[PDB]
Amino acid sequence: AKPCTVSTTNATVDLGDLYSFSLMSAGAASAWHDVALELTNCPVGTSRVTASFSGAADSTGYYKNQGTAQNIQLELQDDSGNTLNTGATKTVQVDDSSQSAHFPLQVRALTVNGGATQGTIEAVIEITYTYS
């Protein structure tokens, strides 16, 4: 189908300041933080948008931190309990009343192996859309 206009070409989510002591134990994590993607001006006949996710993963399968903090990975989910690790897809319906589509998502940091170290958190997840 014909494509929509990507409204949110870049989106940021700031996990803020996390604390090494709170991320010392294996399995520790931050709270979930929202982020969303939006498409607009969806042509008549286009009723579904599929987002395909990609980004650098580490040995836990989650997204790798590219910042200086060690032993931190990043988890992306949708709003329904599905993890969207690299290669995942998510499909949503176009809202005909507004000719728009949106993807409500959430991100957290977690330390699978424990012992997160001080430094920055930086990661980028890329999304390509297909239309049907």
């Binding site: 989106a11 993607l37 990043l74 958190i121």
Partner: peptide, 15 residues
């Protein structure tokens, strides 16, 4: 990429 999500934050040292 059509969109990019940038994740930011900082791990502070409190032991």
């Amino acid at each position: 990429a059509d969109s990019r999500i940038r994740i930011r934050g900082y791990v502070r040292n409190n032991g």
